[PDB]
């Protein structure tokens, strides 16, 4: 009996009844699933074509994907639900929208084209025991009608936004675009403005004025598109595993990247709570709809004058809302939009409506007063079940050092350049000394590498930098190519040169490149 | 009791009844077969005459065919269903369209000319225990009417496209053509745009600008022909077992070839699932047709006013669809095309239609809710029954090496050129030393060849390259001609020359050539 | 009495009468101007924001503009009509749309916002005595309605396209976009598909596959947007006065650039002729409209049944066109579009129409038979009035050499490196020797520079390369900074290094940079 189990149980037992009785599923959102409870915290990543969302997710992962490939070209022709799988592989969308332990059984409504353009990528990763990431198809910039798609992208994105932990909106400076498809998409995101984080990628490859006013043009457009004057927090930088192109704004890029990274790191202890958040949200909206329907039903006459009475009631709907607020003490922010309720109301026959049943309303109030109250202690006890999503480093970060310290000035630390093989900075003679070091299974162990490259008499900080740069697979042990790269850096330092913070793919071994 | 058996059983038990009752077989697609379930994953290969589809399939196979022959001339006068046979041979089309364990009993509708221009090629191959490949006749470029053929090629190709795992569309740069026959064929492929992969062959024999703008002309034409603005993924390269003509775009050719190869390699764990995919597709379409027919039947009056009522109903059909969607909560993408339903409806007498039978609709909904749910565990347990289609290498690839390593720099590896018979680079004196090596059955064993050609004191990587180039039959053991070719390469390296990545037919032994 | 004077005179005398009589100005295009005749050959340059149209025009010019500034940011907030002015300066749009010797009096229709966002840039240039160039505002990619602009951009662009010599459509690989604004703009360009040249800029800064498939995406989109299956010639390259970023496709870039350059060079002897071309075009369209109006007027009854007769005639319009073609022997390609004629016809009162006047039709036929015939000899005599637009080189091209030969192997040519001041490769000591050479007005004359830098004993070809690289202002004489740059190149060659084909702004003197 977990708190998630309690939430789903209370829902299925006594929120679904009024939902089905008053067709809340036919007005705002259909009946929920066990998935929205059993699912892990989730990050949904949207953006137009060629933005680099695949690059973003792989940079977060430090690992490639079973299904999806990085490309500056539009390759994301389908949604990618990358999640924790026991074995490397993938599973399609019609089998994803049914899977008991996946958040997506309620996507079966859209069906057909969405489920064929909907994929899942299962892999074991320490990020993935924590989260699942939904890479959306690149939002089209070809000025396309909604009917041309085989599915309603606005509706699917709204369905996600009702449930996502964090929605990231990725815009690139090189191919800066603001499309009508994205515009109607963000109107689909209306109602959940908290979850959107706007991120400006590829800010390093352009000049200072170019970056300045591409940010400009984008966010003049955004100010009108969102229509909400509240400022949306931006993250300007290059989430990119390669060295910076222009270093004018490196400080700003790294600051924004770190801020976004920590904001993402805050979600694990946020995971069950926002389940409860959405539970309250839908409970209040459901009871407001219940009072609306009950008032309409009681105003419905028996058999005669029904057409005129309905015609009067549809126009009288606003003051009905005012009376409901006054006589039920319910906030004005819980009501749905009056005009939308209008067009949804004429489609219904008023005779079929159900009368007020106080049992449901009373027990929902009892929920909000006491069952969440009981579940609070369970939440506090379960606050540490999974605290460790994080935005991890990569193959080239200051944790890959392993048994090395980061930066310091010991006398047990040594001089800039004292020892390394000189002409052996070529691959075969790297391998000669690599195997005179007696490696195991073609791999020099961590301690053996320590004892060998401490004889280089280089400072321990820079030695750890060499290790973190070379050790691409991040197993804490050096292969042939990683050893060659490390001793390449050592020779370059002998000649006199500063170690790069992150190595380029050029210096990455060819087999270790993506 | 396999998952395929469960799928076919559930179909034949409770999807066929409504099909026959509401003549779904007379409107969209006839009743299915046990074949569509029992069949293996299948690749259907279409393209115009002289494109080289036979060359494609033989390159995938690394083996010739019982029936079909490669020719730059149009030789594919019949469909070729190449599949796994216990013995080398072939079997004709009227006996293929009946065979219990072949996907084609439903081709008997077209009959006569199609079945005479329909062939099967049975052979034992490791590719063929996994897949079957349908080489289509070269799509005619002679601007021909549909009536001139003895069969309806558009309808047969649609029937395939409803069931194929992967449909490949092959277009050649030399004889770049976009015909009206292929155009109406792709309109037959409408509805399954996922399965089409467009491949541009013979991209190496032409210049860079020539290749650039032949790709151009082809895909300007394709953009209008397909009429769907969604980008279709292209594969530009030379799927060709002979050395490249122009090496300007070799990187692009090999990248596209590898991407297509892996996409084909992904089908084995895709084989039963897309059976379930098509099952859902036809179930939803069948129930939508069922509601349409039921609504028409209930609107049908008893005996009088039938002509006027039918004339009104045929025009009223769209809002009937709208009402059906509203009152059954079924996606708009499940409906067939309104106008096509129109012309199909006037041909029918409305009195004969059957009334609504809730039993069938309820039990089909029960299917989609629970029987696929039960079969999911069986799918997961059977996910590894046959994972190994792959796009294998050939007679000249880096696996033919066998007991050799691929590329490396040991000291157990040796110098570029130290030993080989000099004037013996002619066939008879090759054979002299071939038999002084004491071969078995005219064949030098793998270990004997290893010990002999390691005394050549060449690097083990290049020795493995020599082995992979020479060993044409890929049995891991060298015959007289393969040994002669290997030692020819060794002598050429003594003289000083780079080993070709893939050997030309010129250097292929005359008996080992096709 | 020039041929242009004869053309404008014949127009104003006997094409305008039928135009005004049959309100051709109210249906297809208003009455022409003396401007369309007196104007010089003109290149109109369109493209979206940040494409670099200003960079294109300045690269063609080898000169900056009075009004418009280069910027990767959208700076073109107004049309720029850059033309030959006696003095450097600019003049606004409401005074440009009136000027007797400028092509734009007919832009006064649009008025207000267009004329305020319409500018003119007058400067003396050898390109500009030949042509005028219209830099359009960057076509907006913000998915904007037509009403939001203060003027009808589609209509203005159609008005230009009716009169332009060459319309260039510039699309950049970095920020590759295809907007709805540009889409409706090209539908405005419909009818003049000859004049469009599509140019893909910034093709050098991206990788080979990136460039390949950005060209792809652009021209899949273009194939549907233009809707005409006829191939439009593309020009892939970097029209850019700075050294290439990636040199993989330098040959293709320079080939396309040269082809486009020559196509532009062909316009001078094309200038009066296409005036005659548009004259014939509008004459044929005007007479076709005349027969249409005359037939409608004669079918118009006296006073009664007018409403029914007009209602019948508007639907009968197509067979009226067929009868007109049959009885007047006029090509079907001269008629306007039937449906457009429809909606334009209901707005008019049929009683007001004018009856057939054979005088106008007969004299227009007499025009097309005899007055163009008389003007042919004048055209042939005036074929060489201005043959020299050209697409000139720049500050760094193989004509700047002046008194130097380009590339050759004389013995009067000399060795790679024999003489130059060594440590004087810094600015002050450059100036020391610059003034020991006794320059005039701070400038070393061409002959003095020749005699000094021939003592360097470098080959005359490379010496000319040094001169063409250094001489930025292209006056054939070296200033202090140009001399410093030249002798910098000479010292670099002493050290041993290949001379760049075009110098970067980095090596361009700071005062000589833009």
Author numbering:
A (entry chain A), B (entry chain I), C (entry chain J): 22 to 535
From the publication, what sentences describe this entry?
Eps15-homology domain containing proteins (EHDs) are eukaryotic, dynamin-related ATPases involved in cellular membrane trafficking. EHDs harbor a dynamin-related GTPase (G-) domain that binds to adenine rather than guanine nucleotides. EHDs tubulate negatively-charged liposomes in an ATP-dependent manner by the formation of ring-shaped and helical filaments on the remodeled membranes. EHD4/Pincher mediates macropinocytosis required for retrograde endosomal Trk signaling.
In the present work, we reconstitute an N-terminally truncated EHD4 variant on tubular membrane templates and determine these structures by cryo-electron tomography (cryo-ET) and subtomogram averaging (STA). Accordingly, our in vitro reconstitutions were done in the presence of the nonhydrolysable ATP analogue, adenylyl-imidodiphosphate (AMPPNP). The resulting cryo-electron microscopy (cryo-EM) density map had an average resolution of 7.6 Å and 8.5 Å, as determined by FSC and FSC-independent analyses, respectively. EHD4 formed right-handed helical filaments wrapping around the lipid tubes. The EH domains are located furthest from the membrane, the G-domains at the center and the helical domains closest to the membrane. As in the previously reported crystal structures, dimerization of EHD4 is mediated by helix α6 in the G-domain. Interface-2 is formed between the helical domain of one protomer and the G-domain of the adjacent protomer along the filament. Interface-3 is formed between G-domains of two adjacent dimers across the filament and corresponds to the archetypal G-interface that is conserved in all members of the dynamin family. Membrane-bound EHD4 adopted the closed conformation of the helical domain, akin to the reported EHD2 conformation. Thus, helices α8 and α9 in the helical domain engage with the membrane bilayer by inserting hydrophobic residues at the connecting loop into the membrane outer leaflet.
